[PDB]
């Protein structure tokens, strides 16, 4: 397996932005953000498959985050505009060695996992 | 089966399936008579009886060792079967069980929880220990000319070894039932006494094996000479509700040189678990038998009624359909159960071929829908897949 | 697999009344998203009606929207369609489908199994 390692958060006020990077140690095909807020449960934020070569976001993100990838690096960045305090919560790094097709929006699809990334969003 | 094709989308949706949805768990009891073995003593030596009588008394303390584990340690499916355990291994509950099988080797009994469970007792080994051992060992002697006694004394201690080491191998928690824990008669017996209705209960008899398969066992305790310990077996309540499969493939339009690639995300089962639909998205999570499909209730998704309108108009503002994007048409193959979508673009040479004649057509590039009866082979390059 | 089965139609005069059913031999059509359909001489067949599986809701075509009423009959394993204020353009076979994907919001769309009709003629 492939082990993924995060970076870019930070505590930012309404309406700025931010920028997330996540690299991983082997080659990925599925690699995406899924984020868990305080006391909510973990939710889809936005994957690239390249077996594919396409790109998803939930409907909650779509027009603020935008989604990128570097093949050869086997990173992911990820924008992040206009940010409001319910996006506020632990960003986690998803990925999947690769293989066969899976919708990008389940987290059961992905086999990799970090840590996290904290976004915090106030005054 | 009906197999539509949705140009929209370059998808497909089957339907006509018949659901079969688990709805409960049903909690059989068992209690297994062993008899006095641990009173009878084998002192001359080397011997058939000895031996079979020495591994009977070796897997009873066995199994008490591993209740003695498995309670030491427990201080959806597993967590409601420990905890309907936690409530027999109440001594009134035990007591109780055991006095409902008194005169009877089936019964329904009701816990203080409410829960109505059905308690099984297997007395072949104490009915041989009590009936015929203990007169064939005079004076401590085992050495006898009665050979069919140790046959026999193997015939009806096999099932108790057995159940002994499954338990003991998994800690108290069987992942499989096996037959030494409940043989097909006993499975259907307990299929028949399931909280549901009629239709229900003769699909699961007609489906033994999927009832069985999705079932596990507890270890209760040895209470005596009597292992106690619980099946539980699926309850599947609802039954002959719409099912359906959705599988796509790369759409891709091209304007002014810039393609435009959309890839529906939401593909895999559907059921219409009464009232709410769920999703279930890795195919492995469904079985298809006939005209029925088994879905495991676990690793379902609820997903939202609005949801299905994404096979009508994949643009619809009522829903945000699940879909990824893309810029750079990929070449694929999506096998449907009564045919296939071809997704062929620029660099990939794709075709249609029976296995009669060899290649039938070429396709042209965009998404094509193949049926199982216009061929019987699709290929993109040196990629052959063979149709249903 | 179902067997969609249609009755209660017949000859009636101007102004009549009239109570369709549908009904699956052995299957109960509780959870179907049940469509009426009917097919007119010298016109297209046209979904008229339908009712959901999630909540009951319904959709009628202003053909015959408040002159008829879909609802769910024998406890709940049957489908009935009640028809009041009866035309001549009424005049067609009306037949009870499944709809596709469970589903019923607007003109209904046919799904896998489908009756045989039942005539219902309006002098
Ligand atoms: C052919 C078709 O269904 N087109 C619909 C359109 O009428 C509707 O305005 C839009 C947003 O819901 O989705 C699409
Ligand atoms: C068990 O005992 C009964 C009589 O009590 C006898 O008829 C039968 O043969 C015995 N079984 C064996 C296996 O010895």
Redesign the interface.
């Known amino acids: 397996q492939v082990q993924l390692q995060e970076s870019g958060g930070g505590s930012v006020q309404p309406g700025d932005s931010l920028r997330l990077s996540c690299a991983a140690s082997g080659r990925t095909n599925l690699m995406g953000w899924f984020r868990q807020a305080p006391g909510k449960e973990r939710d889809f934020v936005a994957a690239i498959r390249w077996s594919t070569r396409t790109t998803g976001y939930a409907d909650s993100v779509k027009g603020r985050f935008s989604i990128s990838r570097d093949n050869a690096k086997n990173t992911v960045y990820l924008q992040m505009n206009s940010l409001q305090p319910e996006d506020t919560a632990v960003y986690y790094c998803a990925a999947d060695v690769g293989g066969s097709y899976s919708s990008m929006y389940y987290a059961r699809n992905y086999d990799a996992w970090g840590q996290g990334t904290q976004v915090t969003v106030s005054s | 089966?009906?197999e539509?094709y949705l140009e929209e989308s370059c998808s497909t949706?089957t339907?006509?399936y018949?659901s079969v949805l688990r709805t409960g768990w049903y909690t059989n009891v068992f209690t297994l008579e062993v008899g006095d073995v641990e009173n009878l003593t084998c002192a001359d030596g080397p011997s058939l009886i000895k031996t079979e009588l020495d591994l009977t008394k070796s897997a009873l303390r066995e199994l008490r060792t591993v209740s003695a584990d498995q309670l030491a340690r427990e201080e959806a499916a597993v967590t409601a079967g420990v905890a309907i355990a936690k409530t027999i291994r109440l001594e009134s509950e035990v007591t109780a069980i055991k006095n409902a099988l008194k005169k009877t080797n089936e019964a329904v009994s009701t816990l203080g929880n409410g829960v109505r469970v059905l308690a099984t007792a297997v007395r072949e080994l104490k009915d041989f220990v009590s009936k015929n051992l203990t007169r064939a060992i005079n004076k401590n002697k085992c050495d006898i000319p009665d050979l069919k006694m140790a046959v026999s004394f193997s015939q009806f201690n096999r099932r108790f070894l057995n159940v002994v080491r499954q338990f003991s191998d998994n800690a108290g928690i069987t992942p499989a039932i096996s037959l030494d824990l409940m043989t097909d008669a006993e499975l259907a017996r307990a299929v028949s006494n399931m909280p549901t209705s009629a239709?229900q209960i003769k699909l699961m008899l007609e489906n033994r094996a999927m009832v069985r398969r999705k079932g596990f066992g507890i270890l209760i305790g040895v209470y005596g000479s009597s292992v106690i310990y619980m099946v539980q077996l699926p309850i599947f309540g609802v039954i002959?509700?719409?099912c359906?499969i959705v599988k796509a493939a790369?759409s891709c339009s091209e304007k002014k040189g810039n393609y435009a690639?959309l890839?529906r995300?939401?593909?895999?089962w559907?059921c219409?678990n009464?009232?709410?639909?769920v999703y279930y998205?890795?195919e492995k999570d469904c079985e298809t038998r006939g005209?029925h499909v088994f879905c495991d209730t676990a690793?379902g998704?609820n997903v939202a009624?609005?949801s299905?309108?994404c096979?009508?108009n994949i643009s619809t503002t009522?829903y945000?359909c699940?879909?990824?994007?893309?810029?750079?048409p990929?070449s694929?193959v999506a096998l449907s159960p009564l045919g296939a979508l071809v997704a062929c673009y620029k660099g990939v040479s794709c075709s249609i071929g029976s296995n009669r004649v060899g290649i039938i057509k070429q396709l042209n590039k965009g998404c094509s829908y193949i049926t199982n009866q216009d061929a019987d082979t699709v290929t993109i390059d040196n990629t052959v897949y063979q149709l249903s």
């Open positions: 089966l009906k539509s949706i339907e006509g018949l239709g002959d509700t719409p359906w790369p690639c890839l995300e939401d593909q895999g559907y219409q009464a009232g709410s639909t998205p890795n005209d690793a998704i009624e609005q299905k309108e096979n009508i009522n945000p699940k879909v990824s994007t893309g810029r750079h990929i694929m």
